[PDB]
Design a protein around this ligand. Structure first.
Ligand code: CL
Ligand code: CL
Ligand code: CL
Ligand code: CL
Ligand code: CL
Ligand code: CL
Ligand code: CL
Ligand code: CL
Ligand code: CL
Ligand code: CL
Ligand code: CL
Ligand code: CL
Ligand code: CL
Ligand code: CL
Lengths: 11, 11, 11, 11, 11, 11, 11, 11
């Protein structure tokens, strides 16, 4: 589905 | 400065 | 002076 | 969702 | 400096 | 549903 | 700086 | 389905 998500580490 | 970046593996 | 800043780890 | 936030340690 | 942060309105 | 977002203008 | 960003319309 | 996509324009 949607994997990984968002933390701030990359964005 | 900028370290890392986007590969598609997470994003 | 300054210490830290914004890395993405918190923001 | 929201995780962490500003304390002063980094910011 | 680091001003405002989030309200929830956009995020 | 999903509303708002971030452009960089504010955040 | 940080521009473009995300609303869900594309991403 | 999923439309729009990641193009590199924003990400
Ligand atoms: Cl991220
Ligand atoms: Cl990284
Ligand atoms: Cl990535
Ligand atoms: Cl940070
Ligand atoms: Cl908080
Ligand atoms: Cl902090
Ligand atoms: Cl907000
Ligand atoms: Cl914004
Ligand atoms: Cl905007
Ligand atoms: Cl745009
Ligand atoms: Cl988008
Ligand atoms: Cl369109
Ligand atoms: Cl664009
Ligand atoms: Cl994109």
């Amino acid at each position: 589905x949607i994997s990984x998500x968002i933390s701030x580490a990359k964005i």
